[PDB]
Amino acid sequence: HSSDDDLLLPYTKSHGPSHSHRYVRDCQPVAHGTVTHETQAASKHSNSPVLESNIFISDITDDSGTHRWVSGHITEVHDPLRSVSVLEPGGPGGCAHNHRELVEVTAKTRKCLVAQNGGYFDTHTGQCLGNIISDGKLVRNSGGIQNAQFGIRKDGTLVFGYLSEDDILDQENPFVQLISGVVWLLRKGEIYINESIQAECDKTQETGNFRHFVDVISARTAVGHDKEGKLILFHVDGQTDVRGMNLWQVAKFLKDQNVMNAINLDGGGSATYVLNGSLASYPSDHCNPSKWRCPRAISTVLCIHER
């Protein structure tokens, strides 16, 4: 569909770090003890609408003193357990076929009110990446790859952070939704990017390219939660090294929206915001072969649907 020309790649070769969850615990800062994740009971506002979606057009400043206009959406979800779903591309079984699909197409399979692009994927093979649990079904076990995680448990517990392979296979209170990103933006209402860089990039990888992935501006998406337990979906349009935000700016932006924990999902040309099946953002990838903009065929999708 698109030319795939706005690539925002955190890893030059193999996705994710090579070291184990135990290593993440050992390098993690003393302030957090030995637990490498955060939990929050999801809100249960059964008397509210499913969601509230807001458009922002904001003036962002960076350490250079430079000002930039940015535009995007913040989406608040009032009953995450009953309305949030991780979808495979195109429908159930998509990841098994290395299928890539537009967000709007995947979104129409479940009548999503708001849908955004989800996790990372191989742009050459279409292979899905990270851990994936869709509507209680386990879709992909990364094998303990230490990337920022977001999941919902059967009892409504929201989960953010780093999870071991055994964490996601637990049957006592099983995950019903699970998706992986890259970089833990906020932990306990504080910026956590430096810690993420140490945990999600290892000695055998070039930390420079990864730090550049963190520092460069581009289109970005993120998911988090607030003090009330509502789920926060973040999206900002951009183009790598031209428009949008870097992760430091996203973290500060969300921190000033009372977001307590959030992880960064796929961005660049993948960032998409679909409103009721209709593309409602400006993607960065050029079309094949025009200079028009085209949304990218991506992998998993974050869907917010009727309860």
Ligand X SMILES: *[C@@H]1O[C@H](CO[C@@H]2O[C@@H](C)[C@@H](O)[C@@H](O)[C@@H]2O)[C@@H](O[C@@H]2O[C@H](CO)[C@@H](O[C@@H]3O[C@H](CO[C@H]4O[C@H](CO)[C@@H](O)[C@H](O)[C@@H]4O)[C@@H](O)[C@H](O[C@H]4O[C@H](CO)[C@@H](O)[C@H](O)[C@@H]4O)[C@@H]3O)[C@H](O)[C@H]2NC(C)=O)[C@H](O)[C@H]1NC(C)=O
Cite the annotated binding site for N-acetyl-alpha-D-glucosamine by residue number. Answer: 121, 266-267, 270, 296
Does 214 bind ligand X (CB under 6 A)? Our answer is: yes
Which stretches of the chain are assigned E, i.e. beta strand? 37-41, 51-61, 67-77, 84-87, 114-117, 132-134, 137-140, 149-153, 157-161, 175-180, 184-187, 190-191, 220-226, 231-236, 259-264, 273-275, 278-279, 301-304
Applying CB under 8 A, does 283 fall inside the site for a second copy? yes
211 binds ligand X (CB under 6 A): yes
Q: CB 164: neighbour CB atoms within 10 A?
A: 17
* Distance of alpha carbon 8 from alpha carbon 141, whole angstroms: 24
The answer to whether residue 102 forms part of the interface with a second copy (CB under 8 A) is: no
Position 106 contacts a second copy (CB under 8 A): no
Q: Which of residues 102-161 bind ligand NAG (CB under 6 A)?
A: 111, 113
Per CB under 8 A, does 268 bind a second copy? no
Residue 56, classed as helix, strand or coil, is strand
Site size toward ligand X (CB under 6 A) is: 6
Site for ligand NAG in 263-302 (CB under 6 A): 276-278
Burial class (CB in 10 A: 0-12, 13-18, 19+), 33: exposed
Q: Tell me the three state secondary structure of residue 134.
A: strand
Q: Name the residue nearer to ligand X (CB basis): 186 or 301.
A: 186
Using the contact rule CB under 6 A, the part of the chain among 43-51, 210-218, 262-270, 281-289 near ligand X is 210-218
In the complex, the smallest distance separating the C-beta of residue 108 from ligand X, rounded to whole angstroms, is: 39
User: Which x/- pattern, by CB under 8 A, does the window 48-87 give for a second copy?
Assistant: ------xxxx-----------x-x----------------
Distance CA 286, CA 24 (A): 38
Residue from 93, 228, 292, 306 that binds a second copy (CB under 8 A)? Answer: 292
Which span (15-23, 126-134, 193-201, 286-294) binds a second copy, by CB under 8 A? 286-294
CB count in 10 Å sphere of residue 135: 14
Examine residue 207 and tell whether it contacts ligand NAG (CB under 6 A).
Answer: no
Residue 280 lies near a second copy (rule: CB under 8 A): yes
Q: Which does 211 bind (CB under 5 to 8 A by kind): a second copy, ligand X, ligand NAG, none?
A: ligand X
Tally of CA atoms within 13 A in the half-sphere of 254 that contains its CB: 39
β-strand partners of 84: 304
| Three-state secondary structure string covering 209-255 | HHHHHHHCCECEEEEEEECCCCEEEEEECCECCCECECHHHHHHHHH
Residues at the interface with ligand NAG (CB under 6 A):
111, 113, 191, 194, 276-278
Residues at the interface with a second copy (CB under 8 A):
54-57, 69, 71, 237, 239, 242-243, 275-284, 287, 290-294
